[PDB]
Protein backbone atom coordinates (compact mmCIF):
# COMPACT_ATOMS: atom_id res chain seq x y z
CA UNK A 1 0.00 0.00 0.00
CA UNK A 2 1.18 3.43 -1.19
CA UNK A 3 0.58 6.44 1.04
CA UNK A 4 -0.26 9.80 -0.46
CA UNK A 5 2.99 11.82 -0.07
CA UNK A 6 3.18 15.48 0.93
CA UNK A 7 1.38 17.52 -1.74
CA UNK A 8 1.54 21.25 -2.35
CA UNK A 9 -0.82 22.90 -2.77
CA UNK A 10 -3.49 20.69 -1.13
CA UNK A 11 -5.75 19.41 -3.91
CA UNK A 12 -9.41 20.35 -3.35
CA UNK A 13 -10.91 16.85 -3.71
CA UNK A 14 -8.73 13.78 -3.18
CA UNK A 15 -9.82 10.20 -2.50
CA UNK A 16 -7.81 7.02 -2.09
CA UNK A 17 -9.40 4.37 -4.25
CA UNK A 18 -6.89 1.50 -4.18
CA UNK A 19 -3.72 0.06 -2.67
CA UNK A 20 -1.55 1.89 -5.21
CA UNK A 21 0.85 0.37 -7.74
CA UNK A 22 4.37 0.52 -9.07
CA UNK A 23 4.65 2.28 -12.40
CA UNK A 24 6.40 -0.06 -14.85
CA UNK A 25 9.90 0.60 -16.29
CA UNK A 26 8.35 2.04 -19.37
CA UNK A 27 4.86 3.34 -20.08
CA UNK A 28 2.26 3.85 -22.80
CA UNK A 29 1.79 7.52 -23.43
CA UNK A 30 -1.56 8.54 -24.91
CA UNK A 31 -2.88 11.87 -26.17
CA UNK A 32 0.47 13.67 -26.06
CA UNK A 33 0.10 14.97 -29.66
CA UNK A 34 -3.02 17.01 -28.71
CA UNK A 35 -2.30 17.72 -25.02
CA UNK A 36 -0.70 20.96 -23.87
CA UNK A 37 2.90 21.19 -25.20
CA UNK A 38 4.21 22.43 -21.80
CA UNK A 39 2.39 19.79 -19.74
CA UNK A 40 3.89 17.13 -22.00
CA UNK A 41 7.44 18.53 -21.61
CA UNK A 42 7.03 18.67 -17.81
CA UNK A 43 5.87 15.07 -17.96
CA UNK A 44 8.69 14.13 -20.34
CA UNK A 45 11.43 15.66 -18.11
CA UNK A 46 10.10 13.92 -15.02
CA UNK A 47 9.97 10.56 -16.79
CA UNK A 48 13.53 10.92 -18.05
CA UNK A 49 14.77 12.07 -14.60
CA UNK A 50 13.23 8.96 -13.05
CA UNK A 51 14.40 6.43 -15.70
CA UNK A 52 10.98 5.70 -17.20
CA UNK A 53 11.06 4.96 -20.94
CA UNK A 54 8.10 5.74 -23.20
CA UNK A 55 7.06 2.87 -25.47
CA UNK A 56 6.73 3.43 -29.25
CA UNK A 57 4.27 0.58 -29.77
CA UNK A 58 1.53 -0.06 -27.19
CA UNK A 59 2.50 -2.62 -24.53
CA UNK A 60 -0.56 -3.96 -22.63
CA UNK A 61 1.75 -4.95 -19.69
CA UNK A 62 2.93 -1.39 -19.25
CA UNK A 63 1.42 1.33 -17.12
CA UNK A 64 -0.59 3.62 -19.38
CA UNK A 65 -0.64 7.38 -18.97
CA UNK A 66 -3.33 9.41 -20.76
CA UNK A 67 -3.25 13.18 -20.84
CA UNK A 68 -5.20 15.94 -22.60
CA UNK A 69 -7.54 18.88 -22.14
CA UNK A 70 -11.31 18.79 -21.97
CA UNK A 71 -11.33 20.44 -25.44
CA UNK A 72 -9.30 17.61 -27.01
CA UNK A 73 -11.48 14.95 -28.79
CA UNK A 74 -9.79 12.03 -27.04
CA UNK A 75 -12.24 9.27 -25.92
CA UNK A 76 -9.57 6.89 -24.42
CA UNK A 77 -9.20 9.66 -21.74
CA UNK A 78 -12.90 9.89 -20.82
CA UNK A 79 -12.89 6.06 -20.42
CA UNK A 80 -9.93 6.29 -17.95
CA UNK A 81 -11.43 8.95 -15.68
CA UNK A 82 -14.22 6.55 -14.77
CA UNK A 83 -16.96 9.21 -14.58
CA UNK A 84 -14.64 11.90 -13.11
CA UNK A 85 -14.52 14.99 -15.34
CA UNK A 86 -12.74 18.33 -15.52
CA UNK A 87 -15.53 19.84 -17.72
CA UNK A 88 -17.45 21.27 -14.78
CA UNK A 89 -14.32 22.82 -13.14
CA UNK A 90 -13.09 26.42 -13.17
CA UNK A 91 -10.17 27.56 -15.37
CA UNK A 92 -6.84 25.97 -14.39
CA UNK A 93 -8.56 22.95 -12.81
CA UNK A 94 -8.01 19.32 -13.72
CA UNK A 95 -9.03 15.77 -12.80
CA UNK A 96 -6.50 13.06 -12.07
CA UNK A 97 -7.23 9.36 -11.63
CA UNK A 98 -5.01 6.35 -10.97
CA UNK A 99 -6.53 2.85 -10.70
CA UNK A 100 -5.71 -0.50 -12.13
CA UNK A 101 -2.45 0.44 -13.90
CA UNK A 102 -3.68 3.58 -15.67
CA UNK A 103 -3.11 7.28 -14.85
CA UNK A 104 -5.34 9.85 -16.55
CA UNK A 105 -4.95 13.60 -16.49
CA UNK A 106 -7.70 15.85 -17.92
CA UNK A 107 -7.12 19.58 -17.53
CA UNK A 108 -10.01 22.03 -17.91
CA UNK A 109 -7.53 23.95 -20.06
CA UNK A 110 -3.80 23.66 -20.84
CA UNK A 111 -2.86 25.50 -17.62
CA UNK A 112 -4.96 22.79 -15.90
CA UNK A 113 -3.20 19.96 -17.70
CA UNK A 114 0.21 21.33 -16.64
CA UNK A 115 -0.92 21.58 -13.01
CA UNK A 116 -2.26 18.00 -13.32
CA UNK A 117 1.26 16.83 -14.21
CA UNK A 118 2.65 18.83 -11.29
CA UNK A 119 0.36 16.86 -8.99
CA UNK A 120 1.32 13.63 -10.74
CA UNK A 121 5.02 14.50 -10.18
CA UNK A 122 4.43 14.95 -6.40
CA UNK A 123 2.45 11.66 -6.04
CA UNK A 124 5.16 9.42 -7.44
CA UNK A 125 7.75 8.09 -4.99
CA UNK A 126 10.37 5.67 -6.28
CA UNK A 127 8.00 4.57 -9.07
CA UNK A 128 5.12 3.96 -6.66
CA UNK A 129 1.95 5.99 -7.08
CA UNK A 130 -1.17 5.86 -4.92
CA UNK A 131 -4.49 4.97 -6.55
CA UNK A 132 -6.63 8.15 -6.29
CA UNK A 133 -9.48 10.22 -7.77
CA UNK A 134 -8.74 13.98 -7.75
CA UNK A 135 -10.55 17.04 -8.99
CA UNK A 136 -8.66 20.20 -8.18
CA UNK A 137 -8.77 23.96 -9.01
CA UNK A 138 -7.53 27.21 -7.42
CA UNK A 139 -9.44 29.37 -4.98
CA UNK A 140 -7.74 32.59 -6.26
CA UNK A 141 -7.10 32.84 -9.99
CA UNK A 142 -3.94 34.98 -9.88
CA UNK A 143 -1.26 33.59 -7.56
CA UNK A 144 2.38 34.44 -7.23
CA UNK A 145 5.21 36.84 -6.60
CA UNK A 146 5.89 40.53 -7.11
CA UNK A 147 9.69 41.02 -7.08
CA UNK A 148 9.23 44.58 -5.84
CA UNK A 149 11.51 45.08 -2.85
CA UNK A 150 14.34 47.61 -2.37
CA UNK A 151 17.91 46.36 -2.41
CA UNK A 152 19.87 43.95 -4.61
CA UNK A 153 17.52 42.57 -7.33
CA UNK A 154 17.39 38.78 -7.84
CA UNK A 155 19.96 37.52 -10.33
CA UNK A 156 19.07 35.93 -13.67
CA UNK A 157 19.70 32.42 -12.31
CA UNK A 158 17.67 33.29 -9.18
CA UNK A 159 14.71 34.19 -11.39
CA UNK A 160 15.03 31.12 -13.64
CA UNK A 161 15.07 28.88 -10.54
CA UNK A 162 12.19 30.79 -8.98
CA UNK A 163 10.03 30.33 -12.10
CA UNK A 164 10.60 26.53 -12.23
CA UNK A 165 9.55 26.61 -8.57
CA UNK A 166 6.37 28.58 -9.21
CA UNK A 167 5.32 26.08 -11.91
CA UNK A 168 5.87 23.10 -9.61
CA UNK A 169 3.62 24.74 -6.96
CA UNK A 170 0.90 26.03 -9.29
CA UNK A 171 1.78 29.71 -8.87
CA UNK A 172 0.94 31.45 -12.15
CA UNK A 173 2.13 35.04 -11.66
CA UNK A 174 5.50 36.75 -11.48
CA UNK A 175 5.72 40.51 -11.46
CA UNK A 176 9.01 41.97 -12.52
CA UNK A 177 9.21 45.24 -10.54
CA UNK A 178 12.52 45.46 -8.61
CA UNK A 179 12.88 48.90 -7.01
CA UNK A 180 16.58 49.13 -7.60
CA UNK A 181 16.55 48.20 -11.28
CA UNK A 182 17.36 51.59 -12.86
CA UNK A 183 15.41 50.79 -16.06
CA UNK A 184 12.36 49.95 -14.00
CA UNK A 185 12.18 53.18 -11.94
CA UNK A 186 15.00 55.74 -11.51
CA UNK A 187 15.47 55.68 -15.31
CA UNK A 188 12.18 54.21 -16.57
CA UNK A 189 12.25 55.99 -19.95
CA UNK A 190 15.44 54.25 -21.12
CA UNK A 191 15.56 51.05 -23.26
CA UNK A 192 17.11 47.95 -21.78
CA UNK A 193 20.53 47.34 -23.43
CA UNK A 194 20.63 44.43 -25.97
CA UNK A 195 22.13 41.98 -23.49
CA UNK A 196 19.65 42.85 -20.71
CA UNK A 197 16.93 42.19 -23.29
CA UNK A 198 18.44 38.80 -24.01
CA UNK A 199 18.17 37.85 -20.33
CA UNK A 200 14.50 39.03 -20.47
CA UNK A 201 13.78 36.79 -23.42
CA UNK A 202 15.11 33.74 -21.47
CA UNK A 203 12.87 34.78 -18.56
CA UNK A 204 9.82 35.19 -20.76
CA UNK A 205 10.43 31.79 -22.38
CA UNK A 206 10.85 30.02 -19.03
CA UNK A 207 7.70 31.68 -17.74
CA UNK A 208 5.68 30.32 -20.66
CA UNK A 209 7.29 26.90 -20.20
CA UNK A 210 6.11 26.90 -16.58
CA UNK A 211 2.65 28.46 -17.03
CA UNK A 212 3.70 31.62 -15.19
CA UNK A 213 2.22 34.90 -16.46
CA UNK A 214 5.27 37.16 -16.55
CA UNK A 215 4.15 40.67 -15.64
CA UNK A 216 6.39 43.51 -16.80
CA UNK A 217 6.19 46.28 -14.19
CA UNK A 218 7.21 49.88 -14.56
CA UNK A 219 7.27 52.68 -11.93
CA UNK A 220 7.29 56.07 -13.78
CA UNK A 221 6.04 58.03 -10.72
CA UNK A 222 9.39 59.69 -9.88
CA UNK A 223 9.22 62.27 -12.69
CA UNK A 224 6.64 61.37 -15.38
CA UNK A 225 5.14 64.54 -16.92
CA UNK A 226 1.31 64.39 -17.40
CA UNK A 227 0.21 67.36 -19.61
CA UNK A 228 0.83 68.90 -23.06
CA UNK A 229 3.65 67.81 -25.36
CA UNK A 230 5.69 66.52 -22.36
CA UNK A 231 2.82 64.29 -21.24
CA UNK A 232 2.60 62.90 -24.78
CA UNK A 233 6.31 62.28 -24.99
CA UNK A 234 6.33 60.57 -21.56
CA UNK A 235 3.27 58.53 -22.43
CA UNK A 236 4.89 57.38 -25.70
CA UNK A 237 7.76 56.25 -23.47
CA UNK A 238 5.58 53.86 -21.53
CA UNK A 239 4.29 52.56 -24.85
CA UNK A 240 7.71 52.00 -26.41
CA UNK A 241 8.94 50.17 -23.34
CA UNK A 242 5.84 47.97 -22.90
CA UNK A 243 5.90 47.36 -26.67
CA UNK A 244 9.49 46.17 -26.66
CA UNK A 245 8.56 43.59 -23.99
CA UNK A 246 5.38 42.78 -25.83
CA UNK A 247 7.56 42.05 -28.87
CA UNK A 248 9.42 39.35 -26.90
CA UNK A 249 6.20 37.66 -25.77
CA UNK A 250 5.12 39.47 -22.56
CA UNK A 251 1.35 39.57 -22.16
CA UNK A 252 0.86 41.12 -18.68
CA UNK A 253 1.83 44.63 -17.59
CA UNK A 254 1.90 46.68 -14.38
CA UNK A 255 2.26 50.45 -13.86
CA UNK A 256 3.13 51.35 -10.30
CA UNK A 257 2.76 54.55 -8.33
CA UNK A 258 3.94 53.62 -4.80
CA UNK A 259 6.51 55.63 -2.78
CA UNK A 260 6.54 58.80 -4.87
CA UNK A 261 6.08 62.46 -4.04
CA UNK A 262 3.55 63.37 -6.75
CA UNK A 263 0.00 62.66 -5.65
CA UNK A 264 -1.95 63.62 -8.79
CA UNK A 265 -4.71 60.94 -8.48
CA UNK A 266 -6.65 61.85 -11.58
CA UNK A 267 -3.42 62.07 -13.65
CA UNK A 268 -2.24 58.67 -12.33
CA UNK A 269 -5.57 56.97 -13.21
CA UNK A 270 -5.77 58.87 -16.53
CA UNK A 271 -2.40 57.39 -17.54
CA UNK A 272 -3.67 53.92 -16.58
CA UNK A 273 -6.91 54.33 -18.56
CA UNK A 274 -5.08 55.64 -21.61
CA UNK A 275 -2.59 52.75 -21.57
CA UNK A 276 -5.46 50.29 -21.03
CA UNK A 277 -7.22 51.60 -24.18
CA UNK A 278 -4.24 52.21 -26.45
CA UNK A 279 -2.24 49.12 -25.49
CA UNK A 280 -3.98 46.52 -23.39
CA UNK A 281 -7.30 46.38 -25.20
CA UNK A 282 -5.88 47.23 -28.63
CA UNK A 283 -3.48 44.27 -28.53
CA UNK A 284 -6.35 41.99 -27.52
CA UNK A 285 -4.24 39.09 -26.18
CA UNK A 286 -3.03 41.15 -23.19
CA UNK A 287 -4.23 40.41 -19.65
CA UNK A 288 -5.82 43.09 -17.44
CA UNK A 289 -3.50 46.01 -16.48
CA UNK A 290 -2.12 45.96 -12.95
CA UNK A 291 -1.45 48.92 -10.70
CA UNK A 292 -0.63 50.11 -7.18
CA UNK A 293 -1.81 53.62 -6.12
CA UNK A 294 0.38 56.09 -4.23
CA UNK A 295 -1.95 55.31 -1.30
CA UNK A 296 -1.94 51.52 -0.95
CA UNK A 297 -2.46 50.47 2.66
CA UNK A 298 -5.75 51.00 4.46
CA UNK A 299 -4.10 53.37 6.97
CA UNK A 300 -2.99 55.64 4.11
CA UNK A 301 -6.13 55.19 2.04
CA UNK A 302 -8.96 55.65 4.48
CA UNK A 303 -9.83 58.17 7.20
CA UNK A 304 -12.59 57.46 9.75
CA UNK A 305 -14.39 54.93 7.43
CA UNK A 306 -14.08 57.23 4.38
CA UNK A 307 -11.50 57.37 1.54
CA UNK A 308 -8.89 60.13 1.66
CA UNK A 309 -8.71 62.57 -1.25
CA UNK A 310 -6.15 60.67 -3.40
CA UNK A 311 -7.82 57.32 -2.95
CA UNK A 312 -11.34 58.64 -3.63
CA UNK A 313 -10.35 60.44 -6.85
CA UNK A 314 -8.20 57.49 -7.97
CA UNK A 315 -11.01 54.95 -7.38
CA UNK A 316 -13.47 57.29 -9.21
CA UNK A 317 -11.41 57.52 -12.40
CA UNK A 318 -9.60 54.17 -12.71
CA UNK A 319 -11.20 51.82 -15.31
CA UNK A 320 -13.03 48.88 -13.68
CA UNK A 321 -11.04 46.40 -15.81
CA UNK A 322 -7.70 47.29 -14.09
CA UNK A 323 -6.38 45.32 -11.12
CA UNK A 324 -5.67 47.53 -8.13
CA UNK A 325 -3.23 46.34 -5.50
CA UNK A 326 -3.21 47.09 -1.77
CA UNK A 327 -1.05 45.78 1.08
CA UNK A 328 -3.81 45.45 3.74
CA UNK A 329 -4.34 47.55 6.96
CA UNK A 330 -0.71 48.68 6.99
CA UNK A 331 2.30 48.35 4.70
CA UNK A 332 3.66 45.40 6.70
CA UNK A 333 0.91 44.32 9.04
CA UNK A 334 -0.28 41.43 11.28
CA UNK A 335 -3.51 40.67 9.39
CA UNK A 336 -5.93 41.26 6.61
CA UNK A 337 -9.24 40.44 8.23
CA UNK A 338 -12.28 39.98 5.94
CA UNK A 339 -13.66 43.36 7.05
CA UNK A 340 -10.51 45.18 5.74
CA UNK A 341 -10.93 43.50 2.36
CA UNK A 342 -14.62 44.43 2.37
CA UNK A 343 -13.89 48.08 3.08
CA UNK A 344 -11.28 48.49 0.30
CA UNK A 345 -13.12 46.44 -2.31
CA UNK A 346 -16.08 48.72 -1.47
CA UNK A 347 -14.20 51.92 -2.24
CA UNK A 348 -13.08 50.31 -5.53
CA UNK A 349 -16.43 48.61 -6.58
CA UNK A 350 -14.15 45.61 -7.53
CA UNK A 351 -12.21 42.53 -6.49
CA UNK A 352 -8.83 43.65 -5.19
CA UNK A 353 -5.29 42.39 -5.55
CA UNK A 354 -3.18 41.89 -2.41
CA UNK A 355 0.47 42.88 -2.48
CA UNK A 356 1.44 40.95 0.68
CA UNK A 357 4.74 42.38 2.10
CA UNK A 358 6.00 39.21 3.69
CA UNK A 359 8.61 37.67 3.51
CA UNK A 360 10.23 40.87 2.18
CA UNK A 361 12.91 42.13 4.65
CA UNK A 362 14.28 45.27 2.97
CA UNK A 363 13.09 47.42 5.93
CA UNK A 364 14.87 45.22 8.54
CA UNK A 365 17.64 43.35 6.77
CA UNK A 366 19.28 41.46 9.60
CA UNK A 367 16.45 39.03 10.02
CA UNK A 368 15.14 36.28 7.77
CA UNK A 369 11.34 35.99 7.34
CA UNK A 370 10.97 32.20 7.26
CA UNK A 371 7.39 31.62 8.45
CA UNK A 372 4.10 30.71 6.74
CA UNK A 373 1.41 33.02 5.36
CA UNK A 374 -0.21 34.26 8.59
CA UNK A 375 -3.03 36.61 9.58
CA UNK A 376 -4.68 36.39 6.16
CA UNK A 377 -8.41 35.70 6.38
CA UNK A 378 -9.51 32.35 4.94
CA UNK A 379 -12.60 33.85 3.34
CA UNK A 380 -10.50 36.55 1.67
CA UNK A 381 -11.38 35.20 -1.79
CA UNK A 382 -14.76 36.98 -1.46
CA UNK A 383 -13.09 40.36 -2.16
CA UNK A 384 -9.67 39.32 -3.57
CA UNK A 385 -9.03 37.58 -6.91
CA UNK A 386 -5.30 38.29 -7.31
CA UNK A 387 -2.75 37.43 -4.62
CA UNK A 388 1.03 38.00 -4.69
CA UNK A 389 3.75 38.15 -2.05
CA UNK A 390 6.81 40.41 -1.97
CA UNK A 391 9.79 38.10 -1.24
CA UNK A 392 13.21 38.72 0.38
CA UNK A 393 16.25 39.78 -1.57
CA UNK A 394 17.21 36.11 -0.65
CA UNK A 395 15.62 33.98 -3.31
CA UNK A 396 16.43 30.64 -1.82
CA UNK A 397 15.04 31.08 1.67
CA UNK A 398 12.06 33.02 0.31
CA UNK A 399 10.99 29.60 -0.96
CA UNK A 400 9.74 28.49 2.50
CA UNK A 401 7.25 31.34 2.82
CA UNK A 402 6.17 31.25 -0.87
CA UNK A 403 5.59 27.51 -0.60
CA UNK A 404 2.83 28.31 1.95
CA UNK A 405 1.59 31.09 -0.34
CA UNK A 406 0.98 28.43 -2.99
CA UNK A 407 -1.18 26.55 -0.52
CA UNK A 408 -3.08 29.53 0.85
CA UNK A 409 -4.12 30.94 -2.55
CA UNK A 410 -4.88 27.63 -4.20
CA UNK A 411 -6.90 25.98 -1.42
CA UNK A 412 -7.82 28.82 0.90
CA UNK A 413 -10.54 27.53 3.28
CA UNK A 414 -8.45 24.43 3.96
CA UNK A 415 -5.24 26.41 4.73
CA UNK A 416 -3.58 25.54 8.07
CA UNK A 417 -0.48 27.75 8.58
CA UNK A 418 1.38 25.40 10.93
CA UNK A 419 0.70 22.30 8.77
CA UNK A 420 1.67 24.24 5.62
CA UNK A 421 4.81 25.50 7.34
CA UNK A 422 5.91 21.98 8.28
CA UNK A 423 5.13 20.82 4.78
CA UNK A 424 7.17 23.55 3.11
CA UNK A 425 10.27 22.62 5.09
CA UNK A 426 9.60 18.88 4.75
CA UNK A 427 9.37 19.22 0.98
CA UNK A 428 12.29 21.67 0.52
CA UNK A 429 14.90 20.35 3.03
CA UNK A 430 14.59 16.55 2.96
CA UNK A 431 17.07 14.89 5.38
CA UNK A 432 17.65 18.29 7.04
CA UNK A 433 14.02 19.34 7.54
CA UNK A 434 13.82 18.57 11.26
CA UNK A 435 16.85 20.75 12.01
CA UNK A 436 15.78 23.40 9.57
CA UNK A 437 12.46 23.62 11.42
CA UNK A 438 14.27 24.12 14.74
CA UNK A 439 16.19 27.11 13.30
CA UNK A 440 13.45 28.58 11.04
CA UNK A 441 11.02 28.35 13.99
CA UNK A 442 12.95 31.25 15.63
CA UNK A 443 12.83 33.42 12.56
CA UNK A 444 9.19 33.94 11.60
CA UNK A 445 8.22 37.23 13.29
CA UNK A 446 9.14 40.57 11.68
CA UNK A 447 9.04 43.66 13.85
CA UNK A 448 10.93 46.93 13.31
CA UNK A 449 9.40 48.47 16.50
CA UNK A 450 7.56 51.18 14.49
CA UNK A 451 5.60 50.82 11.23
CA UNK A 452 6.39 47.21 10.14
CA UNK A 453 5.03 44.25 12.10
CA UNK A 454 3.97 40.95 10.54
CA UNK A 455 4.22 37.18 10.74
CA UNK A 456 3.68 34.29 13.10
CA UNK A 457 5.26 34.84 16.51
CA UNK A 458 8.77 33.36 16.97
CA UNK A 459 9.00 29.86 18.58
CA UNK A 460 5.75 30.22 20.67
CA UNK A 461 5.82 26.89 22.56
CA UNK A 462 9.28 27.86 23.84
CA UNK A 463 8.15 31.36 24.83
CA UNK A 464 5.33 29.68 26.75
CA UNK A 465 7.78 27.49 28.69
CA UNK A 466 9.99 30.52 29.31
CA UNK A 467 7.01 32.35 30.83
CA UNK A 468 5.93 29.31 32.97
CA UNK A 469 9.48 29.29 34.42
CA UNK A 470 9.29 32.91 35.65
CA UNK A 471 5.84 32.05 37.04
CA UNK A 472 7.05 28.97 38.89
CA UNK A 473 10.10 30.88 40.19
CA UNK A 474 8.43 34.05 41.54
CA UNK A 475 5.71 31.98 43.24
CA UNK A 476 8.55 29.73 44.62
CA UNK A 477 7.40 26.38 43.10
CA UNK A 478 9.68 23.41 42.20
CA UNK A 479 10.81 24.32 38.68
CA UNK A 480 13.48 21.58 38.44
CA UNK A 481 11.62 19.58 35.75
CA UNK A 482 11.07 22.66 33.52
CA UNK A 483 14.74 23.61 33.88
CA UNK A 484 15.80 20.15 32.54
CA UNK A 485 13.14 20.43 29.74
CA UNK A 486 14.64 23.86 28.81
CA UNK A 487 18.30 22.76 28.90
CA UNK A 488 17.16 20.26 26.23
CA UNK A 489 15.52 22.85 23.95
CA UNK A 490 18.62 25.13 24.16
CA UNK A 491 21.08 22.29 23.53
CA UNK A 492 18.87 21.27 20.61
CA UNK A 493 19.01 24.72 18.96
CA UNK A 494 22.76 24.56 19.14
CA UNK A 495 22.85 20.89 17.86
CA UNK A 496 20.50 21.75 14.99
CA UNK A 497 22.16 24.99 13.90
CA UNK A 498 25.55 23.23 13.90
CA UNK A 499 24.10 20.51 11.69
CA UNK A 500 22.69 23.10 9.30
CA UNK A 501 26.11 24.82 9.11
CA UNK A 502 27.76 21.52 8.27
CA UNK A 503 25.23 20.21 5.75
CA UNK A 504 23.24 22.96 4.05
CA UNK A 505 24.02 23.43 0.31
CA UNK A 506 25.85 26.72 -0.54
CA UNK A 507 22.64 28.14 -2.05
CA UNK A 508 20.82 28.06 1.30
CA UNK A 509 23.85 28.47 3.57
CA UNK A 510 25.07 31.68 1.86
CA UNK A 511 21.67 33.21 2.71
CA UNK A 512 21.47 32.28 6.44
CA UNK A 513 24.89 31.51 7.98
CA UNK A 514 25.13 34.73 9.99
CA UNK A 515 21.72 33.94 11.56
CA UNK A 516 22.77 30.37 12.34
CA UNK A 517 25.79 31.84 14.16
CA UNK A 518 23.43 34.26 15.92
CA UNK A 519 21.10 31.51 17.15
CA UNK A 520 23.98 29.37 18.46
CA UNK A 521 25.20 32.42 20.35
CA UNK A 522 21.72 32.94 21.85
CA UNK A 523 21.17 29.26 22.59
CA UNK A 524 24.45 29.33 24.52
CA UNK A 525 23.48 32.45 26.41
CA UNK A 526 20.15 30.85 27.30
CA UNK A 527 21.99 27.81 28.70
CA UNK A 528 24.05 30.15 30.90
CA UNK A 529 20.88 32.03 31.82
CA UNK A 530 19.47 28.77 33.18
CA UNK A 531 22.81 28.18 34.94
CA UNK A 532 22.28 31.59 36.55
CA UNK A 533 18.79 30.54 37.70
CA UNK A 534 20.11 27.27 39.17
CA UNK A 535 23.00 28.93 41.10
CA UNK A 536 20.49 31.41 42.52
CA UNK A 537 18.38 28.50 43.73
CA UNK A 538 21.48 26.78 45.21
CA UNK A 539 22.63 30.08 46.91
CA UNK A 540 26.02 29.41 45.02
CA UNK A 541 27.61 32.83 44.21
CA UNK A 542 30.91 31.74 42.59
CA UNK A 543 28.89 29.89 39.88
CA UNK A 544 26.25 32.59 39.45
CA UNK A 545 28.78 35.39 38.77
CA UNK A 546 30.56 33.29 36.15
CA UNK A 547 27.37 32.15 34.41
CA UNK A 548 26.40 35.83 34.47
CA UNK A 549 29.59 36.86 32.67
CA UNK A 550 28.96 34.15 30.07
CA UNK A 551 25.33 35.25 29.58
CA UNK A 552 26.46 38.91 29.27
CA UNK A 553 29.12 37.94 26.72
CA UNK A 554 26.62 36.10 24.49
CA UNK A 555 24.03 38.88 24.65
CA UNK A 556 26.74 41.47 23.91
CA UNK A 557 27.71 39.46 20.81
CA UNK A 558 24.13 39.19 19.57
CA UNK A 559 23.17 42.82 20.15
CA UNK A 560 26.04 44.25 18.14
CA UNK A 561 26.13 41.61 15.33
CA UNK A 562 24.26 42.47 12.10
CA UNK A 563 22.20 39.22 12.16
CA UNK A 564 18.92 39.35 14.08
CA UNK A 565 16.91 36.39 15.28
CA UNK A 566 14.48 35.34 18.02
CA UNK A 567 14.39 38.88 19.53
CA UNK A 568 11.32 38.28 21.76
CA UNK A 569 12.26 34.65 22.67
CA UNK A 570 15.88 33.33 22.80
CA UNK A 571 17.26 36.91 23.11
CA UNK A 572 14.70 38.30 25.49
CA UNK A 573 15.28 35.26 27.72
CA UNK A 574 18.83 36.43 28.42
CA UNK A 575 17.69 40.02 29.03
CA UNK A 576 15.07 38.68 31.42
CA UNK A 577 17.61 36.64 33.43
CA UNK A 578 19.85 39.74 33.83
CA UNK A 579 17.79 41.80 36.41
Amino acid sequence: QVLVPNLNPTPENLEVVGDGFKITSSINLVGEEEADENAVNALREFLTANNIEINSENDPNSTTLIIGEVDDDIPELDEALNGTTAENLKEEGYALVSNDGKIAIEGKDGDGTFYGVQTFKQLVKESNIPEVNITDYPTVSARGIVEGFYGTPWTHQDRLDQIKFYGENKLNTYIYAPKDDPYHREKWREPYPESEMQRMQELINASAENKVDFVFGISPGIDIRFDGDAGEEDFNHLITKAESLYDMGVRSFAIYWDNIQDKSAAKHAQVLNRFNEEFVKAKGDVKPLITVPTEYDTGAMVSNGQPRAYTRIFAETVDPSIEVMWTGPGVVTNEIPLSDAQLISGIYDRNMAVWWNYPVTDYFKGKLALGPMHGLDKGLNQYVDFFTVNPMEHAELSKISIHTAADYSWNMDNYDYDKAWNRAIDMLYGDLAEDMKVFANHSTRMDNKTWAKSGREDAPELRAKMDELWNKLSSKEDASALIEELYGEFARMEEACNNLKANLPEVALEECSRQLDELITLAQGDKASLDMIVAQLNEDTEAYESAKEIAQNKLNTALSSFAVISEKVAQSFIQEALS
Partner: peptide, 8 residues
Protein backbone atom coordinates in the same frame (compact mmCIF):
# COMPACT_ATOMS: atom_id res chain seq x y z
CA UNK B 1 14.08 59.39 0.45
CA UNK B 2 12.97 55.73 -0.27
CA UNK B 3 15.15 52.72 0.77
CA UNK B 4 12.03 50.97 2.17
CA UNK B 5 8.36 51.94 2.42
CA UNK B 6 8.77 54.02 5.57
CA UNK B 7 5.67 56.24 5.87
CA UNK B 8 6.09 60.05 5.56
Amino acid sequence: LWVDSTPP
